[PDB]
Amino acid sequence: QLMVALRVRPISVAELEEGATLIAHKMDEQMVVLMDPMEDPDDILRAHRSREKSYLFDVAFDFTATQEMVYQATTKSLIEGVISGYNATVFAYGPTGCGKTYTMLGTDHEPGIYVRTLNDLFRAIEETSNDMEYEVSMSYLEIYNEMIRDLLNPALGYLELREDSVIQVAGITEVSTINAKEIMQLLMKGNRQRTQEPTQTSSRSHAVLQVAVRQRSRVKNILQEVRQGRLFMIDLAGSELLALGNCINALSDKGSNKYINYRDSKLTRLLKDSLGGNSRTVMIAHISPASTAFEESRNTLTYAGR
Ligand SMILES: Nc1ncnc2c1ncn2[C@@H]1O[C@H](COP(=O)(O)OP(=O)(O)O)[C@@H](O)[C@H]1O
Ligand SMILES: [Mg+2]
């Protein structure tokens, strides 16, 4: 089960100074349209498509939506399954500067998906602790150029992926506090340990917040399965030698198939046991409404277009 959402951030001053207009428009609660600006001495501008194309998503958001409304529409409903032992995954996707970290982390004055989700998680846990015992841990790591760091304890350095079944980052810090100011301060400071751009957080830094939840019954004279749900909340990287071993392909392409031992990325390996049959995935794509962003916005809307 997959859900795709699209969020349009408000236009920025820097886009207005460059001279941009509005070309992205939420038309509808699940449809956005992308107007084509114009330019060039070229362009047979008549066309036939010719200047406006619509895209449909499970849900859409522009500047009218608040942080909590984005949360309610995207990840709130994952929570019941996670404490019940099901797995779930939320991606913030899109080009740099379009909203990912704002949607996922937010700000002190306007928090995002992380703390809102951690918060309904601890309520749901207490409204059912009549019958159940729970254990909750969370970690917050970076993947930067396939190197993993613990964002809550950078001193430890480069960590590896060891199987402890489930694939876990061997050695990573694990928090259990239930207060949302504390979590938010943790996640704010941990965000600043993300690898920076040599010229600011690198456009190539995945931030993964994972929350594990174990659930066992308080009734001890009947066995019952012990449950382990795993929520992943991801702030992705931005959307934006002779290797002629390519007849390698022009020769596998004769009766099919496969000739490469592909390596799974760290993020794929971490998400392997999750993201499967009875597991949910929520992607939140982000765009600018600015005309100066028309090409990235169209790549994004194409990629997420349901
Ligand atoms: N929907 C939104 N509403 C208001 N401000 C936003 C919104 N999306 C992003 N911003 C702000 O604009 C800037 C966008 O940066 P950011 O969210 O870091 O983009 P990304 O994480 O995709 O690089 C940030 O300063 C953020 O606070
Ligand atoms: Mg970011």
Numbering used by the authors: 11 to 175, 178 to 211, 215 to 255, 277 to 342
Quote the passages of the study that discuss this structure, keeping the authors' original sentences:
KIF19A, a kinesin-8 sub-family member, is unique in that it possesses both functions, MT-based active motility toward the plus-end and MT depolymerizing activity. We recently reported that KIF19A functions as a MT-depolymerizing kinesin in the control of cilium length. Thus, to elucidate the molecular mechanism of the dual KIF19A functions, we performed crystal structure analysis of the mouse KIF19A motor domain as well as cryo-electron microscopy (cryo-EM) reconstruction of the KIF19A motor domain complexed with a MT. In the catalytic core of KIF19A, the KIF19A-specific feature of adopting two different interfaces for MTs and tubulins is utilized to achieve the dual functions.
We investigated the molecular mechanism of the dual functions of the KIF19A 353WT monomeric motor by solving its crystal structure at 2.7 Å resolution. At the initial stage of the 353WT structure determination process, the residues of the switch II helix α4 could not be determined because there was no corresponding density at the site where α4 is usually located at the center of the MT-binding interface. Instead, we found an unmodeled helical-like density, which was more distant from the KIF19A catalytic core. When the Cys283 residue was assigned to this anomalous signal, all the residues in α4 and the following loop L12 were reasonably determined. The overall structure of the KIF19A 353WT motor domain shared a similar triangle-shape with other kinesins, which consists of a central β-sheet of eight strands, sandwiched between six α-helices, three on either side. In the 353WT atomic structure, Mg2+-ADP was found embedded in the nucleotide-binding pocket. In comparison with previously solved motor domains of various KIFs, the remarkable features of the KIF19A motor domain are concentrated on its MT-binding side and include the long and wide L2 loop, the flexible L8 loop, the disordered α4 helix, and the short α6 helix. Loop L2 is located at the minus-end side (rear side) of the MT-binding surface and is atypically long. Loop L8, which is the major MT-binding region at the plus-end side, is more retracted toward the catalytic core compared with that of kinesin-13. The switch II helix α4, which is considered the main contributor to MT-based kinesin motility, is more distant from the motor domain than those of other kinesins including kinesin-8 KIF18A.
